[PDB]
């Protein structure tokens, strides 16, 4: 099982780049939902008063 580990040690950096990609795309999805959320908080809270 240590041999399997040191085999995968060549494939480590690609998974590091994949984690970077996944974090970036999750951040942009949170940006979309935050824009829609702040527009809802405009339209239902501040303008009613």
């Amino acid at each position: 099982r240590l041999l399997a580990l040191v085999k995968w040690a060549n494939n480590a950096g690609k998974v590091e780049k994949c984690a970077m990609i996944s974090s970036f795309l999750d951040q942009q999805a949170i940006l979309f939902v935050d824009t829609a959320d702040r527009l809802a908080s405009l339209a239902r809270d501040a303008l009613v008063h």
Binding site: T35, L42, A46
Partner: protein
């Protein structure tokens, strides 16, 4: 009318923000920006509210005057 069109064009520019660069600083400004526009669209039409108030007094007075004369004429016919 200017503020209506400005609200729609700033919504389109917010769509351009969401297309091009969602991580920009400007969207926070943009999500503030049209808010300010919406405030003004309320703040102008609230300025129609005293005027409307004064104007309803005027038409009430006119209707009041007319009804008096109508009763007068009605009674005189009787």
């Amino acid at each position: 009318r200017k503020l209506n069109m400005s609200i729609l064009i700033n919504f389109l520019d917010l769509l351009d923000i969401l297309i091009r660069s969602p991580g920009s600083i400007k969207r926070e400004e943009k999500l503030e920006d049209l808010k300010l526009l919406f405030v003004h669209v309320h703040h102008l039409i609230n300025e129609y509210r005293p005027h409307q108030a004064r104007e309803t007094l005027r038409v009430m007075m006119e209707v009041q005057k007319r009804q008096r004369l109508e009763t007068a004429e009605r009674f005189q016919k009787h």
